[PDB]
Amino acid sequence: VTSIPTGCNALSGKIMSGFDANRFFTGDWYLTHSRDSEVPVRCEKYQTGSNLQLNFNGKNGDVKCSGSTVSGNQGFYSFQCTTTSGGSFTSYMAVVETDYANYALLYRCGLAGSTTPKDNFLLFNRQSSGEIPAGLSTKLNQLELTSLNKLGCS
């Protein structure tokens, strides 16, 4: 697969310059806010390892993913994921803006039950108590993300 699924936003001109994968894909990231959310809200901790591997506590069971760059879409990654209930899926993401040490705003998109992909904007924080950073104010305005939903971390 050489480009993100049709229907997913490639965010051309909207992704940060100079993304440093080595500084992003290290340590833990808590998913604290998102544009769209479900109930009940939860606190997903994304654990990263070498070679774009990650683990997180998903809605029904732990999830393990293996990432790779998407050849045709700068900044995008494809993650092949499996869940402890026996599920498997492919999810795409790009880091829109991050300071690596505190926050990261991501775009995520993938097929999840239909030909029409579902997408979202996600705010990750290094601390479970993290909220909306001042540094993202202008970017959130530009993307019309002025009321992110708080999830289940504190």
Ligand SMILES: CCCCC/C=C\C\C=C/C=C/C=C/[C@@H](SC[C@H](NC(=O)CC[C@H](N)C(=O)O)C(=O)NCC(=O)O)[C@@H](O)CCCC(=O)O
């Ligand atoms: C450090 C940050 C790294 C970021 C890495 C980026 C992407 C890879 C990681 C996670 C991806 C999660 C995707 C979840 C799918 S849902 C994806 C999938 N579901 C299906 O594919 C179901 C298919 C069909 N609906 C069915 O019922 O069979 C599934 O089983 N998910 C389990 C679960 O969510 O716990 C939806 O809940 C997403 C909804 C919109 C969104 O928030 O993106």
